[PDB]
Amino acid sequence: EPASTLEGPSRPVTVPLRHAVDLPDTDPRVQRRVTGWAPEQIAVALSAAPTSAWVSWITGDFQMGGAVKPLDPGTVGSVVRYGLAADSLVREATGDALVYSQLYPFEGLQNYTSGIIHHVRLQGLEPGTKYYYQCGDPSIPGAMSAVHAFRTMPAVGPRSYPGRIAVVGDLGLTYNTTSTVEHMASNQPDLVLLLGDVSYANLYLTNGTGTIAETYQPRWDYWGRYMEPVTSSTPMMVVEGNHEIEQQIGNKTFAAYSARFAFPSMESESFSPFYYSFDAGGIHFIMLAAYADYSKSGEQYRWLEKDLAKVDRSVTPWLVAGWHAPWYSTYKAHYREAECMRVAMEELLYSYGLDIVFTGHVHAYERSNRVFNYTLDPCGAVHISVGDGGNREKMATTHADDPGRCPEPMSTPDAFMGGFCAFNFTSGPAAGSFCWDRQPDYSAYRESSFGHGILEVKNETHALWKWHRNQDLYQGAVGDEIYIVREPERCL
Ligand SMILES: *[C@@H]1O[C@H](CO)[C@@H](O[C@@H]2O[C@H](CO)[C@@H](O[C@@H]3O[C@H](CO)[C@@H](O)[C@H](O)[C@@H]3O)[C@H](O)[C@H]2NC(C)=O)[C@H](O)[C@H]1NC(C)=O
Ligand SMILES: *[C@@H]1O[C@H](CO)[C@@H](O)[C@H](O)[C@H]1NC(C)=O
Ligand SMILES: *[C@@H]1O[C@H](CO)[C@@H](O)[C@H](O)[C@H]1NC(C)=O
Ligand SMILES: *[C@@H]1O[C@H](CO)[C@@H](O)[C@H](O)[C@H]1NC(C)=O
Ligand SMILES: *[C@@H]1O[C@H](CO)[C@@H](O)[C@H](O)[C@H]1NC(C)=O
Ligand SMILES: *[C@@H]1O[C@H](CO)[C@@H](O)[C@H](O)[C@H]1NC(C)=O
Ligand SMILES: *[C@@H]1O[C@H](CO)[C@@H](O)[C@H](O)[C@H]1NC(C)=O
Ligand SMILES: [Fe+3]
């Protein structure tokens, strides 16, 4: 039987230390495998409730370089035919289409515009049920997809859970990414959470050379094409990271992220692609924005207060959050970088009994002991960071507590969001300092390996967490495993 959080924190563990190569545009998996207006990059996303889901896809090739001419999204329809059997696609839904462009008004830089992106919401679905579907435009010969299938989340209730939820972040599109995704797919998750930093298109110049701020947007299309075997069969929920900012003409940001994925923004009443909520069985998930105003006077905070007040913990016992930047990572990389977000939101989330937090951003794996306001606390959330999806940026290997590695405080805050909130500790072992001189006691486990996690919620009190390292391929391999046990009578 696996160990558990029920008997308190564990003594910290650091796994001793042991670039990825981006997939080339010659890889058949990233090339166009369809012609004309046939769908590609097909992806399923959850709605706010299990009884609805989104199907999205792109029709038409992108344009890169020269005098790009954005496509008219009204010229290709957005239709999904679906049903309970592969030969019985008797239900129909329609949606809307859009394009986005990536434009730079500087000599020598190249412009991009997308294929036509489609988003269709299916309503009136049975929970826990396999649906077969085709997408495309039935009025254009050859413009319908093959038949695909996905399974809706189980019905919302305290003993009803998806079997496995995969959690990844900072995938990029390297050969190590393919290892992460293959490991994940072999675990047959019912749901994928992607905690920001998707394609790493901004590691390229517009002319395709791999390193104002620039991107090579075709990496998004390569990513979407590579991921389609997963996303067309498995719902995937994405939240933005800093690599999605992709600032362009007129200060426009997040164009690719906001256009490409479906989010339950309207259904969960966030009306933002950057944060939203949804239920999957008895789990209420909140995806938060580390890169949209998170201050107590802002819209995201107001939405979050409203969202939390509606959660009934007898219906959804589990309250789980995801966002890009960790609050309790002990690596030097991005150490205390999101402190202002923690200071803004942590007390609100603690007051509502947040159970688990998943993040990315730090290119390594870390699991915290239960913690609130830098204090080990039996009612604090477990913070797990899985930004180790395999992108081409350097792995995080140095720890802030390593001798001589404590960063200068003023160098740590996120420059995009601004502010400084990371003051020296005033109590505990590290009182008077910015960092510890050994692994902090709120850090249970940290390892500089690529991998993915699987969450298996069992009932209203127990969830089994497993993290799998990419370099282990044998059956049943697991790097870190623990039962996360909640105590609602104690903490709520
Ligand atoms: C919610 O799910 C958890 C996890 O499945 C339940 O706890 C688990 O309950 C089973 C059955 O009582 C325990 O199995 C027993 O484990 C011992 C070894 O520890 C073994 O010798 C027995 O033959 C038997 O297999 C299991 O240990 C226990 N696991 C943990 C971490 O507590 C829990 O009871 C469920 N709660 C509700 C309200 O349903
Ligand atoms: C890219 O688009 C911007 C805005 O329309 C324009 O200023 C620029 O000239 C374009 N660059 C090229 C090579 O077409
Ligand atoms: C990334 O993949 C390469 C090639 O398979 C492998 O040699 C390397 O060890 C992987 N890197 C990590 C940190 O696992
Ligand atoms: C892309 O632009 C950079 C910076 O000017 C340049 O160094 C590089 O050689 C260019 N790559 C190509 C394929 O033109
Ligand atoms: C772009 O951002 C700067 C501030 O960073 C601002 O001065 C400027 O007015 C903005 N331009 C537009 C079109 O919003
Ligand atoms: C967190 O700890 C600091 C210093 O002890 C304290 O000033 C602050 O009020 C605490 N924040 C809470 C309880 O939300
Ligand atoms: C905070 O701690 C660092 C060492 O981590 C130290 O250099 C610095 O002087 C401290 N700042 C204050 C105001 O105490
Ligand atoms: Fe990041």
Residue numbers in the entry: 1 to 18, 23 to 215, 228 to 508
Pull text from the paper.
To validate our assignment of specificity pocket contents in TaPAPhy_b2, we turned to site-directed mutagenesis of predicted active site residues. Basic residues were chosen for alanine mutagenesis if they were found less than 6 Å from the predicted position of the bound substrate and were conserved in PAPhy but not in the non-phytase HMW PAPs. This process identified two residues highlighted from analysis of the MD trajectory, His229 (Pocket F) and Lys410 (pockets B and C), and one other, K348. The relative phytase activities of the mutants were <5% for H229A and 13% for K410A. On the other hand, the H229A mutant showed highly attenuated activity toward phytate. Crystallization of this mutant allowed its structure to be solved at 1.50 Å resolution, which proved it to be essentially identical to that of the wild-type enzyme. However, a region of discontinuous electron density was identified between residues Asp216 and Pro227, covering most of the PAPhy 4 motif. The lack of structural order in this region of the mutant enzyme can be explained by the deletion of a π-stacking interaction between His229 and Tyr218 following mutagenesis. Such interruption presumably results in instability of the PAPhy 4 motif, emphasizing the importance of this motif in phytate binding and recognition.
PAPs that can hydrolyze phytate are known as PAPhy (Dionisio et al., 2011). Here we show the X-ray crystal structure of the b2 isoform of wheat PAPhy induced during germination. In keeping with other HMW PAPs, TAPhy_b2 consists of a smaller fibronectin type III (FN3) non-catalytic N-terminal domain (residues Pro43–Thr156) together with a larger C-terminal MPE domain (residues Arg168–Glu497). The high-resolution crystal structures of the wheat purple acid phytase isoform b2 reported herein provide a straightforward explanation by highlighting the roles of two sequence inserts (PAPhy motifs) relative to a canonical MPE domain in forming phytate-specific substrate specificity pockets.
